[PDB]
Amino acid sequence: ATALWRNAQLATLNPAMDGIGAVENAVIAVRNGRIAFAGPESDLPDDLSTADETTDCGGRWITPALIDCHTHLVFGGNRAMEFEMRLNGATYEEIAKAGGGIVSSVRDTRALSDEVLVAQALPRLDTLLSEGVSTIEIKSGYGLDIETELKMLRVARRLETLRPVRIVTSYLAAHATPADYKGRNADYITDVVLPGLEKAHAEGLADAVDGFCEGIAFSVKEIDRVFAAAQQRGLPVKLHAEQLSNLGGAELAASYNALSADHLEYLDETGAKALAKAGTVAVLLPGAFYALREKQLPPVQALRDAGAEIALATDCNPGTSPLTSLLLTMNMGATLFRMTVEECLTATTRNAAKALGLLAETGTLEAGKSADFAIWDIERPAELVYRIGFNPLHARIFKGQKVS
Amino acid sequence: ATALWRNAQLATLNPAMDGIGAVENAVIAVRNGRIAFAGPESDLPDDLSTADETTDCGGRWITPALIDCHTHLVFGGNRAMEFEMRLNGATYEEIAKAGGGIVSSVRDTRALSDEVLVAQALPRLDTLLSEGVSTIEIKSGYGLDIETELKMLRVARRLETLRPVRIVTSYLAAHATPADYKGRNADYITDVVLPGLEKAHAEGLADAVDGFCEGIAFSVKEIDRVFAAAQQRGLPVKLHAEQLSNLGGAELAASYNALSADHLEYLDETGAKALAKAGTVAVLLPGAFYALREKQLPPVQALRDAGAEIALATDCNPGTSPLTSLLLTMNMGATLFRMTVEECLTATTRNAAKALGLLAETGTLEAGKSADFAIWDIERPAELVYRIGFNPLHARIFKGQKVS
Ligand SMILES: N=CN[C@@H](CCC(=O)O)C(=O)O
Ligand SMILES: [Cl-]
Ligand SMILES: [Fe+3]
Numbered sequence: 001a002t003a004l005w006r007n008a009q010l011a012t013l014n015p016a017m018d019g020i021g022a023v024e025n026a027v028i029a030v031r032n033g034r035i036a037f038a039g040p041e042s043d044l045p046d047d048l049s050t051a052d053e054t055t056d057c058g059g060r061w062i063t064p065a066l067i068d069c070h071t072h073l074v075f076g077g078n079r080a081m082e083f084e085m086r087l088n089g090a091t092y093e094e095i096a097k098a099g100g101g102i103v104s105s106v107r108d109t110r111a112l113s114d115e116v117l118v119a120q121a122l123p124r125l126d127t128l129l130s131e132g133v134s135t136i137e138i139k140s141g142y143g144l145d146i147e148t149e150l151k152m153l154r155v156a157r158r159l160e161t162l163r164p165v166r167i168v169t170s171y172l173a174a175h176a177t178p179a180d181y182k183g184r185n186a187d188y189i190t191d192v193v194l195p196g197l198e199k200a201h202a203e204g205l206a207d208a209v210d211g212f213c214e215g216i217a218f219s220v221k222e223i224d225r226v227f228a229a230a231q232q233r234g235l236p237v238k239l240h241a242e243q244l245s246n247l248g249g250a251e252l253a254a255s256y257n258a259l260s261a262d263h264l265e266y267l268d269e270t271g272a273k274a275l276a277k278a279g280t281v282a283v284l285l286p287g288a289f290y291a292l293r294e295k296q297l298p299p300v301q302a303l304r305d306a307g308a309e310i311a312l313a314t315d316c317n318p319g320t321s322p323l324t325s326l327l328l329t330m331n332m333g334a335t336l337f338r339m340t341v342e343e344c345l346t347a348t349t350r351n352a353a354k355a356l357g358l359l360a361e362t363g364t365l366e367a368g369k370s371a372d373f374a375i376w377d378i379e380r381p382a383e384l385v386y387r388i389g390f391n392p393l394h395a396r397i398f399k400g401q402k403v404s
Numbered sequence: 405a406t407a408l409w410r411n412a413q414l415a416t417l418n419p420a421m422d423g424i425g426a427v428e429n430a431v432i433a434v435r436n437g438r439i440a441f442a443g444p445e446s447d448l449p450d451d452l453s454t455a456d457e458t459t460d461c462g463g464r465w466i467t468p469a470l471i472d473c474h475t476h477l478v479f480g481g482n483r484a485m486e487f488e489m490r491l492n493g494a495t496y497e498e499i500a501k502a503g504g505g506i507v508s509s510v511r512d513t514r515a516l517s518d519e520v521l522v523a524q525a526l527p528r529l530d531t532l533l534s535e536g537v538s539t540i541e542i543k544s545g546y547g548l549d550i551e552t553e554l555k556m557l558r559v560a561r562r563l564e565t566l567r568p569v570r571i572v573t574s575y576l577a578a579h580a581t582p583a584d585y586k587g588r589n590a591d592y593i594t595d596v597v598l599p600g601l602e603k604a605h606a607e608g609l610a611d612a613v614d615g616f617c618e619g620i621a622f623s624v625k626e627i628d629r630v631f632a633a634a635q636q637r638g639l640p641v642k643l644h645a646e647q648l649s650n651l652g653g654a655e656l657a658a659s660y661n662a663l664s665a666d667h668l669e670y671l672d673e674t675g676a677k678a679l680a681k682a683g684t685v686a687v688l689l690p691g692a693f694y695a696l697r698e699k700q701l702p703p704v705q706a707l708r709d710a711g712a713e714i715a716l717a718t719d720c721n722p723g724t725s726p727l728t729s730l731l732l733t734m735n736m737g738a739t740l741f742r743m744t745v746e747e748c749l750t751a752t753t754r755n756a757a758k759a760l761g762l763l764a765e766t767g768t769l770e771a772g773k774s775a776d777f778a779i780w781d782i783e784r785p786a787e788l789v790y791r792i793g794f795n796p797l798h799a800r801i802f803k804g805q806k807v808s
């Protein structure tokens with residue numbers, strides 16, 4: 001199966017090229033769902049000059065398909081209630097009393113079947129897909145008991161069978177401490193987190209192991225127990241770090257050569273250097289920053305100076321970032337974090353793929369990788385970061401197949 | 405022609421009711437594109453018990469169609485270039501040599517034919533319509549000469565003939581001075597604004613007269629000349645006031661019974677009370693606030709205390725607020741301005757209609773009004789304000805006809 005997409009402008013994001021690796025008057029040759037060639041039409045090899053199908057892109061811009069490397073897309077119910085209450089002046093105690101807080105998502109997730117969780121997640125997944133997103137990371141963490149933590153991963157896997165999308169999962173039992181384990185974090189990790197990890201891996205339900213290292217969650221030492229267990233099984237690790245305070249989570253992740261450290265509002269210069277040194281991706285999440293009304297900005301310049309690679313994701317979840325637009329995410333990255341257009345585009349493609357350990361597989365328009373790309377009805381790539389609440393997608397191609 | 409909408413929950417926003425006028429197990433009776441009945445299905449009059457059509461809404465929520473009372477939706481080109489340039493550290497002088505600044509929109513709007521402007525606006529209009537919006541206000545203001553200003557109004561009128569939407573226009577020649585009138589605000593008003601208003605009115609192209617009272621634009625005395633002229637021709641006025649400084653534009657607007665005063669970041673107590681006393685709606689625009697990285701928040705509490713009605717709009721424009729989601733606008737209203745869920749829902753329905761002088765015609769699900777409503781896939785109205793970058797619209801009804 002071969003196909004050609006000619007008369008296009010490519011934003012290859014090939015790391016060997018400057019900027020976003022733009023190629024004018026280009027073509028993408030595809031074979032068996034793989035990129036056989038991506039460059040100047042004048043350089044297309046003879047053996048690739050003909051194909052079963054040919055699409056005239058009319059000079060539109062093509063970028064690698066977008067990637068959302070950090071989401072909690074799977075969960076039951078919503079958290080609109082406390083949102084409204086808080087806006088009415090409700091106290092943290094009053095909301096809790098009313099059933100709000102992370103416990104709300106845990107209860108609603110625990111209460112639903114696989115089938116219903118899939119049903120509730122699809123609208124969110126489709127919203128992302130509609131924007132050209134073809135690779136999405138989904139975490140567990142709204143179960144807090146082995147059975148529910150496992151059910152979440154199961155649902156994530158199932159979603160991949162219902163849509164043309166690449167889904168990777170992250171075991172996140174170490175997200176919070178459930179009620180029946182209050183004040184017993186060590187026992188929680190002993191009875192649920194670790195045993196849950198063994199079980200998830202044995203079923204092939206976990207691609208990576210995540211964690212929440214924060215004063216309101218788990219400590220560096222407690223997360224260390226989890227990462228040690230994952231490392232022994234060959235599972236890559238990632239971590240929600242320095243979101244609400246500076247604890248040293250970023251540094252812990254680096255020492256374990258984690259795929260990424262996410263949030264990072266309170267990350268310091270030492271942590272930034274450590275992440276870069278280890279090749280750990282710094283995932284910034286503007287949605288939560290925005291919704292929580294956070295005042296501490298992540299150290300973008302420090303990351304730049306350290307040579308750390310920055311990614312951007314939606315952190316799509318029910319309580320701190322009910323965001324379902326990665327295009328909007330880029331606009332926030334630029335507007336709120338002052339990231340350049342180049343950084344924003346790289347953050348949702350090349351760096352997003354690296355944060356998932358999929359760079360050799362997808363994320364850029366390079367020969368040898370999966371033919372995953374998005375065709376945009378724009379004159380300039382900057383348009384994808386500039387507009388607020390607009391979708392200029394013209395077409396999405398997943399593994400060489402135009403899907404809609 | 406008749407039709408019934410059964411098994412639904414209604415958010416009537418009837419001002420005579422508490423909150424957003426919610427009604428459980430309700431029905432909507434439509435007759436000749438008008439609302440004959442809206443309320444408890446048990447209170448439905450026998451003479452309406454039947455109709456040609458009947459729709460089971462499956463328990464979904466219904467709200468009056470959304471209204472965007474402040475937009476510059478019509479314009480040629482885009483401003484993505486300067487957006488990218490600013491983030492790269494480009495200075496105002498460098499952006500100007502590259503063709504940036506409001507002059508870019510004026511140049512592009514002047515160069516494009518009526519047809520092409522209509523075509524470039526359709527995608528923005530359609531994005532809003534896809535969100536349940538059925539009434540949109542469109543301003544001129546990117547021409548700065550009589551012919552282009554009038555062209556903009558004609559384009560706006562024509563858009564209403566291509567989609568099921570109610571469009572109201574605002575003559576905004578008093579937006580800024582073009583290159584040849586810099587330092588000559590007086591002559592600009594004398595040569596373009598006033599004669600232009602006369603011609604616009606003669607052709608029935610302007611539903612209202614707008615203006616920009618600001619340091620970088622027109623003074624209070626200058627806008628007064630324009631409002632005086634609008635009054636003599638029987639046209640209502642509105643004003644972009646107190647956006648960057650406090651000049652007393654809001655008070656001037658109130659003295660003319662302005663439909664609304666818009667932006668208001670720098671509005672003081674005196675001004676807030678003046679708007680309330682005059683019945684002028686306070687239109688807050690979070691998009692521009694967000695994009696400009698504004699530090700001065702509008703006096704939300706002062707407005708509440710003075711009893712001023714608040715509306716929310718996208719201010720959809722190329723340079724300061726390229727926003728095309730009114731749903732996102734409500735979320736920003738809550739997130740950035742701390743407006744309650746009830747204030748946000750009211751801000752895009754009842755108060756928006758009032759901002760346009762159309763409350764007797766639409767904006768609430770009340771008998772006698774136009775049958776304009778949106779059916780949503782939500783469990784609670786709060787969801788429409790709570791989510792970020794999501795569209796739960798099920799169906800849009802315009803003048804009693806199901807369109808989307
Ligand atoms: N809404 C819940 N998700 C959050 C949990 C953070 C917290 O417990 O404060 C998250 O993914 O980080
Ligand atoms: Cl074209
Ligand atoms: Fe998260």
Ligand SMILES: [Fe+3]
Nearest residue numbers: 474476644719
């Ligand atoms: Fe405006």
Ligand SMILES: [Mg+2]
Nearest residue numbers: 060377378379
């Ligand atoms: Mg095009």
